[PDB]
Design a protein around this motif. Structure first.
Motif, PDB file in Angstrom:
ATOM      1  N   UNK A   1      -2.865   4.847  10.336  1.00 53.45           N
ATOM      2  CA  UNK A   1      -2.101   4.942  11.573  1.00 53.45           C
ATOM      3  C   UNK A   1      -1.277   3.679  11.804  1.00 53.45           C
ATOM      4  N   UNK A   2      -0.609   3.612  12.956  1.00 50.08           N
ATOM      5  CA  UNK A   2       0.203   2.450  13.296  1.00 50.08           C
ATOM      6  C   UNK A   2      -0.614   1.295  13.860  1.00 50.08           C
ATOM      7  N   UNK A   3      -1.854   1.543  14.287  1.00 54.89           N
ATOM      8  CA  UNK A   3      -2.695   0.467  14.800  1.00 54.89           C
ATOM      9  C   UNK A   3      -3.212  -0.421  13.677  1.00 54.89           C
ATOM     10  N   UNK A   4      -3.550   0.173  12.531  1.00 60.93           N
ATOM     11  CA  UNK A   4      -4.025  -0.604  11.395  1.00 60.93           C
ATOM     12  C   UNK A   4      -2.914  -1.417  10.744  1.00 60.93           C
ATOM     13  N   UNK A   5      -1.651  -1.129  11.074  1.00 62.28           N
ATOM     14  CA  UNK A   5      -0.538  -1.739  10.353  1.00 62.28           C
ATOM     15  C   UNK A   5      -0.540  -3.253  10.507  1.00 62.28           C
ATOM     16  N   UNK A   6      -0.715  -3.747  11.735  1.00 65.63           N
ATOM     17  CA  UNK A   6      -0.667  -5.189  11.961  1.00 65.63           C
ATOM     18  C   UNK A   6      -1.798  -5.899  11.226  1.00 65.63           C
ATOM     19  N   UNK A   7      -3.019  -5.376  11.344  1.00 62.70           N
ATOM     20  CA  UNK A   7      -4.163  -6.006  10.693  1.00 62.70           C
ATOM     21  C   UNK A   7      -3.992  -6.018   9.180  1.00 62.70           C
ATOM     22  N   UNK A   8      -3.611  -4.876   8.604  1.00 60.40           N
ATOM     23  CA  UNK A   8      -3.458  -4.802   7.156  1.00 60.40           C
ATOM     24  C   UNK A   8      -2.334  -5.708   6.672  1.00 60.40           C
ATOM     25  N   UNK A   9      -1.212  -5.745   7.398  1.00 59.87           N
ATOM     26  CA  UNK A   9      -0.102  -6.599   6.994  1.00 59.87           C
ATOM     27  C   UNK A   9      -0.483  -8.069   7.064  1.00 59.87           C
ATOM     28  N   UNK A  10      -1.191  -8.475   8.120  1.00 55.11           N
ATOM     29  CA  UNK A  10      -1.613  -9.867   8.221  1.00 55.11           C
ATOM     30  C   UNK A  10      -2.589 -10.225   7.107  1.00 55.11           C
ATOM     31  N   UNK A  11      -3.526  -9.325   6.802  1.00 60.13           N
ATOM     32  CA  UNK A  11      -4.465  -9.592   5.724  1.00 60.13           C
ATOM     33  C   UNK A  11      -3.783  -9.726   4.377  1.00 60.13           C
ATOM     34  N   UNK A  12      -2.874  -8.798   4.063  1.00 65.21           N
ATOM     35  CA  UNK A  12      -2.189  -8.867   2.776  1.00 65.21           C
ATOM     36  C   UNK A  12      -1.270 -10.081   2.719  1.00 65.21           C
ATOM     37  N   UNK A  13      -0.648 -10.457   3.841  1.00 71.57           N
ATOM     38  CA  UNK A  13       0.177 -11.659   3.857  1.00 71.57           C
ATOM     39  C   UNK A  13      -0.658 -12.897   3.570  1.00 71.57           C
ATOM     40  N   UNK A  14      -1.841 -12.992   4.182  1.00 66.97           N
ATOM     41  CA  UNK A  14      -2.710 -14.133   3.915  1.00 66.97           C
ATOM     42  C   UNK A  14      -3.172 -14.148   2.463  1.00 66.97           C
ATOM     43  N   UNK A  15      -3.510 -12.978   1.917  1.00 68.35           N
ATOM     44  CA  UNK A  15      -3.931 -12.911   0.518  1.00 68.35           C
ATOM     45  C   UNK A  15      -2.806 -13.339  -0.419  1.00 68.35           C
ATOM     46  N   UNK A  16      -1.581 -12.885  -0.150  1.00 75.34           N
ATOM     47  CA  UNK A  16      -0.448 -13.254  -0.989  1.00 75.34           C
ATOM     48  C   UNK A  16      -0.147 -14.742  -0.858  1.00 75.34           C
ATOM     49  N   UNK A  17      -0.294 -15.297   0.347  1.00 78.96           N
ATOM     50  CA  UNK A  17      -0.121 -16.730   0.510  1.00 78.96           C
ATOM     51  C   UNK A  17      -1.144 -17.530  -0.272  1.00 78.96           C
ATOM     52  N   UNK A  18      -2.404 -17.090  -0.247  1.00 75.97           N
ATOM     53  CA  UNK A  18      -3.432 -17.762  -1.036  1.00 75.97           C
ATOM     54  C   UNK A  18      -3.133 -17.660  -2.528  1.00 75.97           C
ATOM     55  N   UNK A  19      -2.683 -16.489  -2.980  1.00 75.62           N
ATOM     56  CA  UNK A  19      -2.317 -16.341  -4.380  1.00 75.62           C
ATOM     57  C   UNK A  19      -1.159 -17.237  -4.777  1.00 75.62           C
ATOM     58  N   UNK A  20      -0.155 -17.347  -3.904  1.00 81.22           N
ATOM     59  CA  UNK A  20       0.970 -18.239  -4.166  1.00 81.22           C
ATOM     60  C   UNK A  20       0.512 -19.689  -4.233  1.00 81.22           C
ATOM     61  N   UNK A  21      -0.386 -20.089  -3.329  1.00 80.19           N
ATOM     62  CA  UNK A  21      -0.923 -21.445  -3.372  1.00 80.19           C
ATOM     63  C   UNK A  21      -1.670 -21.695  -4.675  1.00 80.19           C
TER      64      UNK A  21
END
Ligand SMILES: *[C@@H]1O[C@H](CO)[C@@H](O[C@@H]2O[C@H](CO)[C@@H](O[C@@H]3O[C@H](CO)[C@@H](O)[C@H](O)[C@@H]3O)[C@H](O)[C@H]2NC(C)=O)[C@H](O)[C@H]1NC(C)=O
Ligand SMILES: *[C@@H]1O[C@H](CO)[C@@H](O[C@@H]2O[C@H](CO)[C@@H](O[C@@H]3O[C@H](CO)[C@@H](O)[C@H](O)[C@@H]3O)[C@H](O)[C@H]2NC(C)=O)[C@H](O)[C@H]1NC(C)=O
Lengths: 359, 395
Positions: A1-21
């Motif tokens: 749904x649209x409620x999970x969108x913010x949480x999932x996007x923030x989680x994947x953004x943090x994971x991608x940032x950690x991978x980039x680091x």
């Protein structure tokens, strides 16, 4: 749904940032292959540890205040049901048995049959009014489930963050001892431990941000969510009353309570008349009528307590205490912990960059 | 069991074959105003007139025979006339006592009915006016507490039930009016009849004394011109026999079926069940008022229990309400004592005793009075016939 969108996007953004680091650190290491810096790193680590400890203690205070408020709003919703059950049981069993006994005793004279029938009808009206009060057994179980699950989750998270603080203190002390011991190779070979603690700090920041945004969303319009979650299961009028307790708002139980209290008064007046005019009749009936007035006295006292219990002031105050606690305190603590995790990540990145340089 | 039983003389008197005016059988159905019964009763008067004519023509034949073709007869006729006057006086006094016994019984029954109606009216007025006014005052006083509205409404509904139940009691105005009219008529008729027959007895005694004086005065012409008065008093005696026989037959017909006729008289103005209950009750009947009286007295009990309870639990409120509540209990006390008096009045014993006193005072007394008065008429007719027969023979 649209409620999970913010949480999932923030989680994947943090994971991608950690991978980039991690990729950047690997590139720096492959490309490669001070007392002032040491004291600076120690000071920043101490500041981060202090910030994290304060934030964790703050969140602990808030999430135990929430449990206290839940358990103080659960006790009321249980005492109210206990009072209603006691009154219903009393008027269904004791009053009916005693009135049947009295009718059997004084059936010889048929004049009092009319008033006994009227008082029986009033007892039936009392029972019908009492059954009209809502049953809170479906909300008490919910407030137990929350009060237990939240407590368990808070304890587990508190233990995890104490473990993280202990690990960071241990690694800082190990680094200090290695520096004091002329940088022993085994002591200074903790690049893997540094990577592990950095990725743990990144994951902690991810979880902190996700929880902070989730609680901020659930605090943006708490009343609508609580009405859509449980306020739909039960009658919406009672939820509307308890949530926004106000002077202008009319009580939803005033009609039922006033009819019940009027019925109690009418039953009392009938019983008093019967007592006064039962002296010419057999005095053995006064023994039972004394029990009848005992029941009426107890019912009146219980009703006064109940109408002091349905009052929205106490429940509204407990709900506001719970809401202020969770929303304000938890948001502040999670923001502090996110700043802590960011500080730890920056300190670890600087240490890794200056690791081989010092060596 | 005490009740009305027809004596031998009344049934024997009824046993005479009733006839119409044209000599045809007529039923013994009592009907004071119906044409066939009035003609049947007038048939007895016609028969008595025929008998009077037969006696007159026989006496004329005898006097003509003894004239054309001494004090013993006068003494015998005078003694027989005196005995006849004595019997007539006894009968007249007896039936006068019977008629005034009927009048007294009717007055007693009328007084009891008037008391019943007065009690019903007083209680109904009390519940309609005094209780409602006091309740309005009490509600105005204690409107501050909203709990007592329920009990006030319940006991107002009790007041409505009480008024409805009281209005169901019969109204006795028509019965009391009828009884008063009948008592006045009976007193008037009895007084006039008693005076008339005392006058007749006095006239007969005067004629006998005139006969004695004329005999003692060697047949003075002024004391011998009394034959006209003798003939007039003889025809008066025969008319008296006519009236006595007619009234005796009528009242025997009534006494044969008293209760049925009484039921027929007022079978529509009031319910027939209560009339039958008053007329017939020896041991126990259904007592049709018992259910209504029990429900009413139960309603009064609920009234007074509500009022007592409200008194007990209204002392926390200011005792200004007691100035009305004690008045309300005064009203209930008065209503209860009035209801006890009323249920004592509705008992059929008193009314049935009054009715049986009236029925005995007619059947067992007036019948004997009329019979002895008719015997007087026969004896006076015979005595004066003999006296006239001895008139010309004396001189
Ligand atoms: C929240 O409210 C619920 C009910 O609304 C509470 O649960 C009830 O707690 C009481 C006392 O703790 C229980 O009574 C006794 O429980 C013991 C077990 O400890 C049992 O052996 C006794 O026979 C007796 O039942 C009651 O059973 C329990 N459940 C219900 C449905 O009333 C609860 O304690 C409140 N607080 C929390 C933190 O959940
Ligand atoms: C028999 O019972 C009655 C009932 O109470 C006694 O009261 C009398 O009731 C009659 C009702 O028919 C009264 O007659 C009426 O009088 C009014 C004038 O007040 C007149 O307008 C009507 O046309 C009718 O004639 C009568 O006056 C009344 N008598 C008294 C003294 O109030 C009655 O007294 C009882 N009879 C005896 C002999 O006691």
């Amino acid at each position: 749904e649209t409620y999970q969108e913010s949480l999932l996007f923030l989680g994947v953004l943090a994971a991608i940032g950690l991978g980039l680091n991690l990729i950047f650190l690997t590139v720096y290491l492959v490309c490669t292959c001070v007392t002032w810096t040491a004291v600076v790193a120690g000071l920043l680590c101490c500041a981060a540890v202090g910030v994290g400890f304060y934030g964790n203690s703050e969140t602990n205070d808030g999430m135990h205040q929430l449990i206290y408020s839940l358990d103080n709003a659960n006790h009321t919703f249980s005492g109210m049901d206990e009072l209603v059950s006691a009154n219903t049981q009393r008027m269904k069993v004791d009053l009916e048995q005693h009135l049947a006994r009295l009718s059997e005793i004084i059936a010889a004279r048929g004049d009092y049959i009319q008033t006994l029938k009227f008082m029986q009808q009033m007892a039936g009206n009392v029972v019908s009014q009492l059954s009209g009060l809502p049953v809170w057994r479906e909300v008490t179980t919910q407030l137990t489930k929350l009060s237990h699950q939240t407590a368990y989750v808070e304890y587990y998270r508190w233990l995890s963050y104490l473990l993280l603080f202990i690990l960071d203190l241990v690694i800082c002390l190990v680094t200090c001892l290695g520096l004091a011991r002329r940088s022993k190779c085994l002591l200074a070979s903790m690049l893997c431990c540094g990577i592990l603690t950095l990725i743990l700090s990144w994951a902690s920041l991810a979880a902190d941000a996700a929880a902070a945004v989730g609680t901020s969303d659930f605090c943006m319009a708490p009343d609508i969510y609580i009405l859509n979650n449980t306020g739909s299961q039960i009658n919406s009028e009672v939820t509307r009353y308890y949530l926004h307790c106000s002077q202008s708002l009319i009580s939803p139980f005033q009609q039922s309570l006033t009819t019940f209290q009027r019925s109690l008064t009418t039953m009392q007046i009938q019983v008093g008349g019967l007592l006064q005019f039962a002296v010419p009749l057999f005095p053995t009936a006064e023994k039972d009528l004394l029990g009848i007035q005992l029941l009426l006295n107890n019912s009146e006292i219980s009703l006064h307590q109940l109408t002091a219990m349905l009052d929205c002031r106490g429940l509204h105050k407990d709900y506001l205490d719970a809401l202020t606690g969770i929303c304000y305190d938890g948001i502040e603590g999670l923001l502090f912990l996110g700043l802590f995790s960011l500080l730890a990540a920056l300190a670890f990145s600087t240490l890794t960059c200056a690791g081989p340089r010092a060596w």
